[PDB]
Design a protein around this nucleic acid. Sequence first.
RNA 1: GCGGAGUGAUCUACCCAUGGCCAGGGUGAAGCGCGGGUAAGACCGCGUGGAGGCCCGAACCCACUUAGGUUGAAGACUGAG
RNA 2: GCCAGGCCAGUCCGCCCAGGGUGAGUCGGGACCUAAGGCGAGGCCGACAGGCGUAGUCGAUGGACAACGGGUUGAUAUUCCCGUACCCGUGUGUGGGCGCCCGUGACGAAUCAGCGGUACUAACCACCCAAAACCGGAUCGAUCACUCCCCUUCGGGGGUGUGGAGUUCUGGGGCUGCGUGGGAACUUCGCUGGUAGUAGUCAAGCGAAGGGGUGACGCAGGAAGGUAGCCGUACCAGUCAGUGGUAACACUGGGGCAAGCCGGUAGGGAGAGCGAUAGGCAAAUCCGUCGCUCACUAAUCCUGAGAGGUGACGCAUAGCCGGUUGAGGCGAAUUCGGUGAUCCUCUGCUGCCAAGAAAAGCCUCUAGCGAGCACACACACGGCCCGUACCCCAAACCGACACAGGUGGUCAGGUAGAGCAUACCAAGGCGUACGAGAUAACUAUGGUUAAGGAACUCGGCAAAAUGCCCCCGUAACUUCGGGAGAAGGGGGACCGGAAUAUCGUGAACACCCUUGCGGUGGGAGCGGGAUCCGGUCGCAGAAACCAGUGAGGAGCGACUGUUUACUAAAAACACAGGUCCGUGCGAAGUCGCAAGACGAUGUAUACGGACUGACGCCUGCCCGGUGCUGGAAGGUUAAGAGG
RNA 3: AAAUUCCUUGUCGGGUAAGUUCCGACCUGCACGAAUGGCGUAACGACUUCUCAACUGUCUCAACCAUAGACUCGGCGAAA
RNA 4: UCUGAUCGUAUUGGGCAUCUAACCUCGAACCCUGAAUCGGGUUUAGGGACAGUGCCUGGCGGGUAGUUUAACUGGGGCGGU
RNA 5: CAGCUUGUUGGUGGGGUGACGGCCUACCAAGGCGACGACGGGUAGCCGGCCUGAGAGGGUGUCCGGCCACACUGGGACUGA
RNA 6: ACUGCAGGGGAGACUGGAAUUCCUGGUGUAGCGGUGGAAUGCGCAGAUAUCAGGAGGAACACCGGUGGCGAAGGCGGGUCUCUGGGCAGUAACUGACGCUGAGGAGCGAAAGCGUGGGGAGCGAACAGGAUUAGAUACCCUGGUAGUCCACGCCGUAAACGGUGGGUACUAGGUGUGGGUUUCCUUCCUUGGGAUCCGUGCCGUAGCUAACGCAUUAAGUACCCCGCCUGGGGAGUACGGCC
RNA 7: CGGGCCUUGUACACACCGCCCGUCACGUCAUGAAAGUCGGUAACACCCGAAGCCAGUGGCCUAACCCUCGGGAGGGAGCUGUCGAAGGUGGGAUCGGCGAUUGGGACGAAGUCGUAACAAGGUAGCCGUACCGGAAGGUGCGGCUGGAUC
RNA 8: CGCGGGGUGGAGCAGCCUGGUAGCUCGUCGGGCUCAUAACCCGAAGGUCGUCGGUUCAAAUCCGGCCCCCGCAACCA
Length: 272
Amino acid sequence: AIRKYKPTTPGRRGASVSDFAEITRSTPEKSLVRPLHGRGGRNAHGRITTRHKGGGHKRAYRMIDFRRNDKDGVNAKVAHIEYDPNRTARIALLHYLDGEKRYIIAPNGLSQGDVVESGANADIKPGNNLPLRNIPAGTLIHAVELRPGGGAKLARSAGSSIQLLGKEASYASLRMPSGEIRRVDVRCRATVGEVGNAEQANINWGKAGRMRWKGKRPSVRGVVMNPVDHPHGGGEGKTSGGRHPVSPWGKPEGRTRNANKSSNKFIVRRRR
RNA sequence: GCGGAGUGAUCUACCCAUGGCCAGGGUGAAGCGCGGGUAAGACCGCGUGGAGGCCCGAACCCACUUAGGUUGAAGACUGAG
RNA sequence: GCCAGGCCAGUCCGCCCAGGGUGAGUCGGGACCUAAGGCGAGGCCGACAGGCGUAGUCGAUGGACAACGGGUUGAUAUUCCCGUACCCGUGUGUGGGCGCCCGUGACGAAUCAGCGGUACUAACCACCCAAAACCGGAUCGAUCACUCCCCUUCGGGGGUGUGGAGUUCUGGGGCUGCGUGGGAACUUCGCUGGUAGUAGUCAAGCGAAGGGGUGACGCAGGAAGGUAGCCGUACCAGUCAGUGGUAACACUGGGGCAAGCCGGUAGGGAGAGCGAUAGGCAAAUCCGUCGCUCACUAAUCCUGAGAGGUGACGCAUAGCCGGUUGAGGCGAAUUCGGUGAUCCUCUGCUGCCAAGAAAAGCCUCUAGCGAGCACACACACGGCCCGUACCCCAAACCGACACAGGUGGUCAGGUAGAGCAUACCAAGGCGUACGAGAUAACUAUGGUUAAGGAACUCGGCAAAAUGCCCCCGUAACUUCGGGAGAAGGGGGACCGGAAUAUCGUGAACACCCUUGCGGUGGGAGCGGGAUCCGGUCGCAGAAACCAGUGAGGAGCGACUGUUUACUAAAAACACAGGUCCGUGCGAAGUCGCAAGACGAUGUAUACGGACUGACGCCUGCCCGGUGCUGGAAGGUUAAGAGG
RNA sequence: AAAUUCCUUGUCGGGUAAGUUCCGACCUGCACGAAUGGCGUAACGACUUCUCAACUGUCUCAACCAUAGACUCGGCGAAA
RNA sequence: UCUGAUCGUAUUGGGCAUCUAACCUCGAACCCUGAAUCGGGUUUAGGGACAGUGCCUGGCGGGUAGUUUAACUGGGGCGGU
RNA sequence: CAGCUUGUUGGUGGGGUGACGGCCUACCAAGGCGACGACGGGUAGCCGGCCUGAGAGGGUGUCCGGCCACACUGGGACUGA
RNA sequence: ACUGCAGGGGAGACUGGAAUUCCUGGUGUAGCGGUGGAAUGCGCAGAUAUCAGGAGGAACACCGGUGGCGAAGGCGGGUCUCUGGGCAGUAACUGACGCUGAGGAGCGAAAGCGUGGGGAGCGAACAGGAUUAGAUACCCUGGUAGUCCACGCCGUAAACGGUGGGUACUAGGUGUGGGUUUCCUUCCUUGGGAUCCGUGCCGUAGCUAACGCAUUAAGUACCCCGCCUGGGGAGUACGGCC
RNA sequence: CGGGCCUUGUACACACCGCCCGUCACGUCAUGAAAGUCGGUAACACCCGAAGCCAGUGGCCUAACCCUCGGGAGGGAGCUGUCGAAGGUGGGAUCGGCGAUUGGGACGAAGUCGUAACAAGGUAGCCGUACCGGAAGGUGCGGCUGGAUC
RNA sequence: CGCGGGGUGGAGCAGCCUGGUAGCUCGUCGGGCUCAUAACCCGAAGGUCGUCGGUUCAAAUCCGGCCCCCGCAACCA
Ligand SMILES: [Mg+2]
Ligand SMILES: [Mg+2]
Ligand SMILES: [Mg+2]
Ligand SMILES: [Mg+2]
Ligand SMILES: [Mg+2]
Ligand SMILES: [Mg+2]
Ligand SMILES: [Mg+2]
Ligand SMILES: [Mg+2]
Ligand SMILES: [Mg+2]
Ligand SMILES: [Mg+2]
Ligand SMILES: [Mg+2]
Ligand SMILES: [Mg+2]
Ligand SMILES: [Mg+2]
Ligand SMILES: [Mg+2]
Ligand SMILES: [Mg+2]
Ligand SMILES: [Mg+2]
Ligand SMILES: [Mg+2]
Ligand SMILES: [Mg+2]
Ligand SMILES: [Mg+2]
Ligand SMILES: [Mg+2]
Ligand SMILES: [Mg+2]
Ligand SMILES: [Mg+2]
Ligand SMILES: [Mg+2]
Ligand SMILES: [Mg+2]
Ligand SMILES: [Mg+2]
Ligand SMILES: [Mg+2]
Ligand SMILES: [Mg+2]
Ligand SMILES: [Mg+2]
Ligand SMILES: [Mg+2]
Ligand SMILES: [Mg+2]
Ligand SMILES: [Mg+2]
Ligand SMILES: [Mg+2]
Ligand SMILES: [Mg+2]
Ligand SMILES: [Mg+2]
Ligand SMILES: [Mg+2]
Ligand SMILES: [Mg+2]
Ligand SMILES: [Mg+2]
Ligand SMILES: [Mg+2]
Ligand SMILES: [Mg+2]
Ligand SMILES: [Mg+2]
Ligand SMILES: [Mg+2]
Ligand SMILES: [Mg+2]
Ligand SMILES: [Mg+2]
Ligand SMILES: [Mg+2]
Ligand SMILES: [Mg+2]
Ligand SMILES: [Mg+2]
Ligand SMILES: [Mg+2]
Ligand SMILES: [Mg+2]
Ligand SMILES: [Mg+2]
Ligand SMILES: [Mg+2]
Ligand SMILES: [Mg+2]
Ligand SMILES: [Mg+2]
Ligand SMILES: [Mg+2]
Ligand SMILES: [Mg+2]
Ligand SMILES: [Mg+2]
Ligand SMILES: [Mg+2]
Ligand SMILES: [Mg+2]
Ligand SMILES: [Mg+2]
Ligand SMILES: [Mg+2]
Ligand SMILES: [Mg+2]
Ligand SMILES: [Mg+2]
Ligand SMILES: [Mg+2]
Ligand SMILES: [Mg+2]
Ligand SMILES: [Mg+2]
Ligand SMILES: [Mg+2]
Ligand SMILES: [Mg+2]
Ligand SMILES: [Mg+2]
Ligand SMILES: [Mg+2]
Ligand SMILES: [Mg+2]
Ligand SMILES: [Mg+2]
Ligand SMILES: [Mg+2]
Ligand SMILES: [Mg+2]
Ligand SMILES: [Mg+2]
Ligand SMILES: [Mg+2]
Ligand SMILES: [Mg+2]
Ligand SMILES: [Mg+2]
Ligand SMILES: [Mg+2]
Ligand SMILES: [Mg+2]
Ligand SMILES: [Mg+2]
Ligand SMILES: [Mg+2]
Ligand SMILES: [Mg+2]
Ligand SMILES: [Mg+2]
Ligand SMILES: [Mg+2]
Ligand SMILES: [Mg+2]
Ligand SMILES: [Mg+2]
Ligand SMILES: [Mg+2]
Ligand SMILES: [Mg+2]
Ligand SMILES: [Mg+2]
Ligand SMILES: [Mg+2]
Ligand SMILES: [Mg+2]
Ligand SMILES: [Mg+2]
Ligand SMILES: [Mg+2]
Ligand SMILES: [Mg+2]
Ligand SMILES: [Mg+2]
Ligand SMILES: [Mg+2]
Ligand SMILES: [Mg+2]
Ligand SMILES: [Mg+2]
Ligand SMILES: [Mg+2]
Ligand SMILES: [Mg+2]
Ligand SMILES: [Mg+2]
Ligand SMILES: [Mg+2]
Ligand SMILES: [Mg+2]
Ligand SMILES: [Mg+2]
Ligand SMILES: [Mg+2]
Ligand SMILES: [Mg+2]
Ligand SMILES: [Mg+2]
Ligand SMILES: [Mg+2]
Ligand SMILES: [Mg+2]
Ligand SMILES: [Mg+2]
Ligand SMILES: [Mg+2]
Ligand SMILES: [Mg+2]
Ligand SMILES: [Mg+2]
Ligand SMILES: [Mg+2]
Ligand SMILES: [Mg+2]
Ligand SMILES: [Mg+2]
Ligand SMILES: [Mg+2]
Ligand SMILES: [Mg+2]
Ligand SMILES: [Mg+2]
Ligand SMILES: [Mg+2]
Ligand SMILES: [Mg+2]
Ligand SMILES: [Mg+2]
Ligand SMILES: [Mg+2]
Ligand SMILES: [Mg+2]
Ligand SMILES: [Mg+2]
Ligand SMILES: [Mg+2]
Ligand SMILES: [Mg+2]
Ligand SMILES: [Mg+2]
Ligand SMILES: [Mg+2]
Ligand SMILES: [Mg+2]
Ligand SMILES: [Mg+2]
Ligand SMILES: [Mg+2]
Ligand SMILES: [Mg+2]
Ligand SMILES: [Mg+2]
Ligand SMILES: [Mg+2]
Ligand SMILES: [Mg+2]
Ligand SMILES: [Mg+2]
Ligand SMILES: [Mg+2]
Ligand SMILES: [Mg+2]
Ligand SMILES: [Mg+2]
Ligand SMILES: [Mg+2]
Ligand SMILES: [Mg+2]
Ligand SMILES: [Mg+2]
Ligand SMILES: [Mg+2]
Ligand SMILES: [Mg+2]
Ligand SMILES: [Mg+2]
């Protein structure tokens, strides 16, 4: 699934790339495409709020359907598996029997041509979308909602899944990819299966220019700055920072979650 | 030098949208064909193909060395590399 | 014009004075469209000042949209004039065509009477249970009343059999009900006659709200087919350049012309009918989706460079006449090849990953409007605002200067050459603003140098050297790609011959045919390249200009990259790779008092921060100190409560 | 004995006619040391450093030629 | 009768649990709306007297700010005073 | 010591020799040798014989006899049966 | 070839329960743990113990053996899917198609290596305690890689029967696994006999230096292959291949 | 503590007051690596190329043969060309010697440190592998009996 | 050179600013245990407290002077 380049140049020695063997129809669906423009990590004030962003190839947004609420009982057929520059997972184009086109995140094992169902009366097969009440415990799911009707938020990256632990009264227990136990309403929805393209994390980008294409600008270590620029700056030779490590704005390392956040009631165990 | 209120990104730093430009040579990746090899394979030899922060080299962009300039042709340049 | 300016002078001038000079339906912009971004009705937020933003409206560097060739002035010309085109709108005629009322064809319901659903379901049936109650068996316990038996301190145990409230298991009736499915009607449904072909609808044209399609998009790489251009050439018109030859093809010049329209080639691209319809907020014959029949190699349609015709009975031109050297008049031939694009077919094709605007415009669908419309020809008209002179790699711009600096795009000839390098030239420009002399030292910029050859110097700094095409040949080491143009060598000019198809490109005259912009053979003329053999010349054949020095051992950084504009380009920064910490989602983090924003139209294989810095082998011990993470037994500790 | 070693031109070997630099070692580490990473490493470098071939006015040791100044004449005509 | 432990009313305080109606929701639908991912209102789905905010109060706080950091001295620094 | 070979392997026409022959040459074809050890490295004149041994074997090549090679080192031809 | 037969032979997918550890909650109070004896350690902030619920990984008690299958290494929770070999019977078919096998290729315990995941228990390294003259150990308390999974590499073991493969022949006795088979066919006995293929013990001839082997040869013979030539140096250096 | 009988293991027989392993220190011998350095051998590519054969040319010389008496034929000297030994240049291959320093090996006396193996050798031992440790070795995983147990 | 720390039994270390009494481990000697040696056990012994010169009734101790040893600094041109 990962193809390795031959060491023809210094910049392709250890590099690797997807084989793109799951991809059909290398062009997108014209009516589901909206424009994007880069922002260079600049907010509404025009200032850099996120460093190390900018440059990179031009992209077009593809409308992914994260609700899957209005087509319960209407079946769909997978037409194409396509490339998507906005996420690590591939996306599937669905032809609903009523004649509507939609993108969903392609699960693992959703070859072109398979049929896909939604609603409480759907089989437990990869690509089906059900309320959590209807999914048996011990099942791998993805694209889970945090609130009923809020859209899929959890387990959308490539290779991700959520393991449904159990349903007690009106709450389901989930083990999320980070490994922490959360509790959600059983009226939330999820798609059955694991997100595909699970091998993409083994890609070795060979050179700096390849990351510039994906839109990351170079990152300067704070220890080779001047004291005016970073708390780690200064020194005659090279140093380790003359103090305990801190952020560029002087914040020390440590937990940054709000201690009295309103969602603590839904967190069973913090990640390890 | 300190404070208050304003002016500046037509220079320069970075970013955003939209256009344009890069003579001529060389090398020969993946893939794909053919033949060999086998039970099938790996693998091998040829073709095709034209990859690459690839090579030599004008425009173009730089500024490493040296000589000249140093009340300059020029408040940072010229010649030769 | 000449007293300032111009680095001298000046009769000249980008200087000074007066007058004149810029002509657009089509060029570049607006009146058309939107991108990043700006402003922003209400709005939200903010003590005030104000911040941000929705609807909206601006905003090209992009999209859409109609003109070419010649002539003319001292100064403008795709603008004026001539010839020939194209685009939008207006009016008036002529002609046929389709419409409404009319009429007219197509479609076409609706009420009330005949059966099942047994759909509905009072009851009923099948099933299990409380199978209620109750009749009543067995199991357990220290109660317990009767009778058989016993000790005593006189109150009860045991032998306790029976039952009593009896625990439990559990036998039968299982009425009454639970539940399911069959399951009475009226009530909902459909069929036939049936209101009746009745009500009603549709059938000119426009539709711009709204739906849909298109518009609509990356980078790299060619090939094939063409054309511009360029070089020859039939043919035409001329020359004798006072030199040894040269009298006509020996030499010189010409050997032309657009948009538009016609045309449909090379090359590309495309299934069509019928039905149904949850979707495209309403609707839809459109789009989407599904199904059937046929075709599926084809036919047909679209598209499309080029060739060809017209444009052109015109314009232009070599030259010749007359010629204040100004304006004028006449004006020949114009065929066939080669080479060849950065241009065109091509918004195509192939490959790749990094996955490559929007809106208008155009087309279509219906909502709707609708009694008059659409069409052909002819004629006559309307085509608005701004720019247009001149410089524009510069003496007219940015540099205080008529300043060796800087300034985006388009075009771009010949011979040699791989080439937009380089040399010399064409078209066309220019000699640019102090000069004239003179063999001083010395400085600068170039050139040559006997013998030696780094002895110079901090240091081979600078210079010298190598350098091209073709052919042999090429090491350690290696991450198997490299190193490598390693190193080191050999050939190179001209003439003749092989050589008349030597070979390879294109392919004229002449050979068939589904007759065409067709095919096959054919090989002319015109160009390309290499070899072998023989000869000739010089000191030298890469000929001038142009054009790698190579090898070896260490250190640092893996590598390409970036940096102190103006003394530091590096061993510094970055980098792919690694590890740790944080973050469960208007997340963490950052900008903001806040709202709001970015993160991200992302979701732990993700994002932020920290350190290390390709790859290989590895990364040992210490938790005492200070941080970080967790905990809460104890000690100390604020306001508040208490008083 | 190091981009780290003061003593110090440590000592031994190699290279040179002669080597405070260079290469290989020794360990007596003033004061190396494992992600402020340790030790290596093919390729790469207008990096630093040492050696060789070729070549040369860098040098022994200079000489000559041409041009722009300098110098002379006419014009204009500053500066610290 | 320290009455230590215990009774029933008060009264209020402290946890603890539940509720919904304040309040919250960048969950959803509809309307203002003709064009609206803003805003507001209506309904619903949740959370919930918590959170957020005001006043008071303790901690932490080179993130930022204002400042201080002696003199003598056979120059100053180090030493000493 | 695992790949060696381009007059190399074969053919045709010529040349050359006392004689066949890539012995030589022009052209044509693409063969030839190799694990039964090609190519390479080490050593060595070979034999009748001699020494040993029950024999088979092992060692050896000196006197004598046969053959080969050479004549200071390398190359070349001439004269001649 | 047909018909039967036995089997932890192999691969994949799903799935079960006991137990250990941890987490949550209840009860509960001062010890637990460990040894030759102790200490380190855990706990009093509520441990060990006990009860209920949950998570997760690994190994599969009884069956179970001396027994089975596989070329060897190896193979046992269950079910399903796919798949290899063996034996017996028949004698239907082919008609010597056989054996061995230099080089070569494939498979090949464990440890180890790479990339990714997982991690209960165990446990190199490491730390503390104890013992000891010392204790880089044995014993104790912890504990990382690893052990597990996917996909590759590695190619070695006292990889052993310390016994290469094929074939024929040479007393028996006695167990056990898989068939077939008359007769005694009920003597129900699933006993006896006969025959074929395994796997053990004991024993004659024969062999052996002896120990022992002995129809499963280390006996009697034939075919092919590998290997040995005193002990060290040394399965090491150099060269090469991976 | 000592003794007796039987049985078991043994690498002991000077008979456990036995045998025996590995570092370290001193000495000797042989050998591997090493910046580099000194020799030998056989080739290869190219440059230059003597003699000589062969092939050409050959105005200079030439008795026999021919002649029309001028010469002709034929020959030679010289010259050119292929091949060509020796030599030169270059990059490799291969066989040895030395080499500061460094790795192990063997043998030495009556040196130092432990006690790994042989008995259940005092923790059964060996095999493969990995990590660790002054050293014999230890520990983990798997294996074997060439060990024990009822 | 400046500054601050040290010198105690054969060796490694306490005791010292507190002036009145020098101790611990290993070592050494003798005795046990052993065939003998280690290891183990028992009993002992051993010191001008770097020198000198001061305060003091009294100094290892307090203070100055020299001697060795160690550590930290010797900087700006
Ligand atoms: Mg702003
Ligand atoms: Mg970042
Ligand atoms: Mg960085
Ligand atoms: Mg810095
Ligand atoms: Mg700054
Ligand atoms: Mg700071
Ligand atoms: Mg710092
Ligand atoms: Mg620093
Ligand atoms: Mg430092
Ligand atoms: Mg660090
Ligand atoms: Mg100011
Ligand atoms: Mg501003
Ligand atoms: Mg190029
Ligand atoms: Mg290929
Ligand atoms: Mg490049
Ligand atoms: Mg270049
Ligand atoms: Mg430029
Ligand atoms: Mg720069
Ligand atoms: Mg200079
Ligand atoms: Mg000067
Ligand atoms: Mg310069
Ligand atoms: Mg330059
Ligand atoms: Mg004047
Ligand atoms: Mg003047
Ligand atoms: Mg307002
Ligand atoms: Mg605004
Ligand atoms: Mg806007
Ligand atoms: Mg506009
Ligand atoms: Mg524009
Ligand atoms: Mg003009
Ligand atoms: Mg006109
Ligand atoms: Mg698009
Ligand atoms: Mg072409
Ligand atoms: Mg003449
Ligand atoms: Mg002509
Ligand atoms: Mg349709
Ligand atoms: Mg035409
Ligand atoms: Mg104009
Ligand atoms: Mg003009
Ligand atoms: Mg202009
Ligand atoms: Mg100017
Ligand atoms: Mg200028
Ligand atoms: Mg040119
Ligand atoms: Mg040029
Ligand atoms: Mg010129
Ligand atoms: Mg003069
Ligand atoms: Mg010279
Ligand atoms: Mg010379
Ligand atoms: Mg030199
Ligand atoms: Mg010198
Ligand atoms: Mg000198
Ligand atoms: Mg130089
Ligand atoms: Mg030069
Ligand atoms: Mg070369
Ligand atoms: Mg090289
Ligand atoms: Mg000559
Ligand atoms: Mg070159
Ligand atoms: Mg080194
Ligand atoms: Mg150095
Ligand atoms: Mg670098
Ligand atoms: Mg490194
Ligand atoms: Mg480069
Ligand atoms: Mg600078
Ligand atoms: Mg540089
Ligand atoms: Mg510089
Ligand atoms: Mg930097
Ligand atoms: Mg936040
Ligand atoms: Mg993490
Ligand atoms: Mg960190
Ligand atoms: Mg770094
Ligand atoms: Mg990084
Ligand atoms: Mg580093
Ligand atoms: Mg570390
Ligand atoms: Mg610590
Ligand atoms: Mg700590
Ligand atoms: Mg701690
Ligand atoms: Mg804390
Ligand atoms: Mg050293
Ligand atoms: Mg150092
Ligand atoms: Mg030195
Ligand atoms: Mg030198
Ligand atoms: Mg030097
Ligand atoms: Mg050195
Ligand atoms: Mg360091
Ligand atoms: Mg570190
Ligand atoms: Mg290093
Ligand atoms: Mg660079
Ligand atoms: Mg550099
Ligand atoms: Mg003068
Ligand atoms: Mg509150
Ligand atoms: Mg509060
Ligand atoms: Mg602070
Ligand atoms: Mg401050
Ligand atoms: Mg102040
Ligand atoms: Mg002072
Ligand atoms: Mg002083
Ligand atoms: Mg030949
Ligand atoms: Mg022949
Ligand atoms: Mg010999
Ligand atoms: Mg014999
Ligand atoms: Mg000879
Ligand atoms: Mg002699
Ligand atoms: Mg000779
Ligand atoms: Mg004779
Ligand atoms: Mg002869
Ligand atoms: Mg498996
Ligand atoms: Mg656990
Ligand atoms: Mg508990
Ligand atoms: Mg418990
Ligand atoms: Mg037969
Ligand atoms: Mg075999
Ligand atoms: Mg074999
Ligand atoms: Mg294998
Ligand atoms: Mg393993
Ligand atoms: Mg592993
Ligand atoms: Mg490891
Ligand atoms: Mg792993
Ligand atoms: Mg354990
Ligand atoms: Mg342990
Ligand atoms: Mg320990
Ligand atoms: Mg073996
Ligand atoms: Mg085994
Ligand atoms: Mg063996
Ligand atoms: Mg056998
Ligand atoms: Mg046998
Ligand atoms: Mg048997
Ligand atoms: Mg024997
Ligand atoms: Mg036996
Ligand atoms: Mg035997
Ligand atoms: Mg070995
Ligand atoms: Mg080796
Ligand atoms: Mg007796
Ligand atoms: Mg014995
Ligand atoms: Mg020795
Ligand atoms: Mg050696
Ligand atoms: Mg000759
Ligand atoms: Mg040596
Ligand atoms: Mg042992
Ligand atoms: Mg022992
Ligand atoms: Mg022991
Ligand atoms: Mg033992
Ligand atoms: Mg250990
Ligand atoms: Mg072991
Ligand atoms: Mg074991
Ligand atoms: Mg300094």
